[PDB]
Ligand SMILES: CC(=O)Nc1cccc(-n2c(=O)n(C3CC3)c(=O)c3c(Nc4ccc(I)cc4F)n(C)c(=O)c(C)c32)c1
């Protein structure tokens with residue numbers, strides 16, 4: 001099916017900026033479609049084992065998930081291609097604009113909650129990678145999701161890793177506990193605070209990795225009491241951000257939260273905002 | 281650099297298989313006598329090295345070469361706080377590099393722009409890496425496996441050790457493992473004493 | 486020396502509700518339908534109470550505090566027993 | 574050991590059978606559980622909202638299954654890490670959390686908020702596994718462990734008494750007790766240099782024979798079936814590997830974690846003359 005022979009080379013946002021991706025326009029019927037450069041050094045014995053775990057990535061056609069076109073190998077790198085979105089990601093928009101108002105935040109929360117609920121209910125796949133860097137926005141006004149951990153063997157065989165000055169892990173995760181669905185809620189709440197204020201909130205408004213990983217575990221979780229917001233937003237973030245996993249609500253009981261219902265019953269112009277922020 | 285074929289880094293300086301590839305790809309159960317002999321040779325070589333006021337700043341299981349039972353230690357003058365350098369996404373952590381660092385070194389810097397040398401190396405921190413080597417050579421695999429970097433950093437920084445669920449032997453080997461991984465620097469042993477401790481055979485054959 | 490709370494039955498739970506927090510008398514029947522025995526009295530959570538039907542905030546807070554006080558009072562009876570066992 | 578027992582691949586029939594022994598008041602929910610085909614993976618991640626989709630409108634009936642599920646998760650996921658240092662983690666973490674929260678609040682002329690009592694209760698609950706493992710066979714024949722047990726018990730008794738006695742202020746007292754608890758937990762984590770605090774428990778298989786093996790099970794409040802008062806007759810310990818402190822988890826290849834003591838004795842006495850069990854032996858040393 002898919003092969004690297006028929007994929008061309010097009011323009012890109014940057015060269016080496018963070019990770020490396022490259023837009024591709026298919027020669028046949030002009031399929032505009034992006035590519036992901038994933039580089040590994042693995043013996044061929046487990047190569048097939050990794051290869052067999054990307055079919056579940058294509059067997060999911062929910063509206064709030066980026067499409068999957070195929071996967072192939074070419075000269076020491078695994079190539080995985082997904083539908084190209086002309087909007088970008090929440091990181092870039094956050095850096096340019098500065099913050100995001102309440103209504104857009106509510107719509108994004110609704111979209112990600114629906115996507116996570118679908119994934120967990122249908123295939124029992126835990127995202128484990130939830131951050132503003134994994135939410136793709138289109139131009140019409142849609143919201144999608146990508147880069148969710150499906151193949152655990154790829155983690156066990158990853159060539160390298162990166163840490164960075166921003167971490168979105170959970171206090172139970174840093175103490176060696178297993179991965180559960182309740183870990184995603186903490187990261188989602190932290191992301192919500194990040195897009196609400198404009199910066200990483202863990203250092204209250206630098207210093208080594210350990211002094212962050214131990215500040216997260218011991219110090220009280222951040223709160224948005226220092227500015228005038230909607231009360232329901234504050235209670236939603238409060239429920240999302242709690243140290244003990246048992247006090248953190250499952251996704252099926254924040255979908256009935258008053259804030260989410262208010263967001264659902266309303267209607268706000270996402271298309272105008274996304275068009276204005278980007279270059280038309 | 282003669283007694284234990286110490287290498288200072290095709291007629292000479294030949295390269296081949298190592299200890300890491302041996303114990304991993306071959307999956308061969310090393311005999312107890314071979315384990316004791318290899319440990320004794322490594323201890324003697326490092327004790328000789330420590331006597332010339334030069335610090336082995338990077339000891340892993342890929343920096344040892346075994347040829348017909350003769351150990352070789354190499355690449356003891358390269359690693360530093362500048363050799364690792366990566367992009368704005370954060371520090372690039374190799375796959376099996378965070379389980380060889382003592383707690384005093386695990387406090388690395390995030391922005392990848394440290395002025396001068398961030399780390400400080402001492403012979404007290406070097407013997408810590410010997411404990412991991414013996415653990416992996418007697419048990420069969422690494423430590424802190426199937427964990428992310430952001431978890432290993434915090435777990436090690438608290439002063440922890442992998443639970444000994446895969447070892448079945450006397451109290452001597454476990455006592456030595458606890459001796460190597462001691463949280464306080466000064467209470468760690470020195471290679472002169474460790475060679476004597478390992479010389480008294482815990483068991484024979 | 487009251488009996489161990491782990492062995493309590495329902496009747497003991499309604500007696501406890503009558504004695505300790507008899508002021509909020511319109512919610513006692515809720516414990517009857519939902520079968521709150523001794524074991525479940527320890528692990529009742531704020532979400533669990535909210536589900537059970539304590540709509541008003543103040544009454545739910547008062548009941549939460551009373552149950553918390555009871556759970557703390559039953560904790561001493563374990564520490565002392567373990568201390569006596571340790572002394573032997 | 575591990576091959577016989579798994580929890581992430583349980584067929585719905587096994588989940589249905591295990592739930593039966595939890596209580597005699599849950600006979601009517603077996604059919605509904607069988608209909609939806611709730612496997613082991615879904616069982617381990619059960620939540621209160623889901624249980625209301627199977628007709629379990631009673632909170633008291635929910636709590637029993639929640640407790641059994643939590644016990645099963647604790648036994649399965651952390652079987653190979655249940656050592657002395659791991660239990661010392663929670664003793665320290667909760668104390669430091671409470672201390673930092675109290676320092677940040679900087680409250681004055683106010684009563685102890687219910688959240689503070691909740692954290693205090695959570696902290697004392699974490700002491701129970703530590704003391705329960707400390708007073709057993711590995712650490713009952715040495716003086717240092719006894720002194721550590723006495724010190725931590727004194728600190729816990731002060732913690733509980735100060736809170737329960739009267740309201741506010743005792744806030745500096747509770748802060749100081751938290752600091753002492755944290756320091757002692759750090760001492761057991763780092764300073765102690767004995768290799769016992771590293772080795773966790775282990776699994777084993779035991780066969781017993783129409784003689785009734787007289788190990789009177791003294792079930793605690795948590796359903797942990799611990800063997801006590803092994804009869805002095807020679808064959809019981811000559812042919813069996815049971816000892817004081819041993820824990821029974823499986824009968825004839827069937828998990829019984831979190832059950833009620835009544836059915837365990839009933840199952841044992843109604844079992845076949847030849848029986849097979851799984852024992853969670855206390856840590857030892859293979860001195861060869
Ligand atoms: C240490 C740690 O947490 N590791 C970890 C933990 C969970 C997830 C990941 N994970 C990841 O982060 N990425 C991002 C970084 C590139 C992946 O792309 C990625 C990936 N591919 C992928 C999947 C779907 C789509 I639509 C696009 C894709 F590209 N597949 C197939 C995975 O199963 C993993 C291994 C990925 C990594």
Ligand SMILES: Nc1ncnc2c1ncn2[C@@H]1O[C@H](COP(=O)(O)OP(=O)(O)NP(=O)(O)O)[C@@H](O)[C@H]1O
Pocket residue numbers: 017018019020021034035082083084085086088089131133134136369
């Ligand atoms: N199909 C796509 N559509 C739009 N943007 C894309 C697409 N694929 C990749 N990108 C962008 O490519 C850039 C590099 O992505 P990548 O390095 O894989 O992840 P990241 O979110 O930027 N960083 P990180 O959170 O550390 O993994 C980001 O700005 C993405 O938004």
Ligand SMILES: [Mg+2]
Pocket residue numbers: 019147
């Ligand atoms: Mg990416």
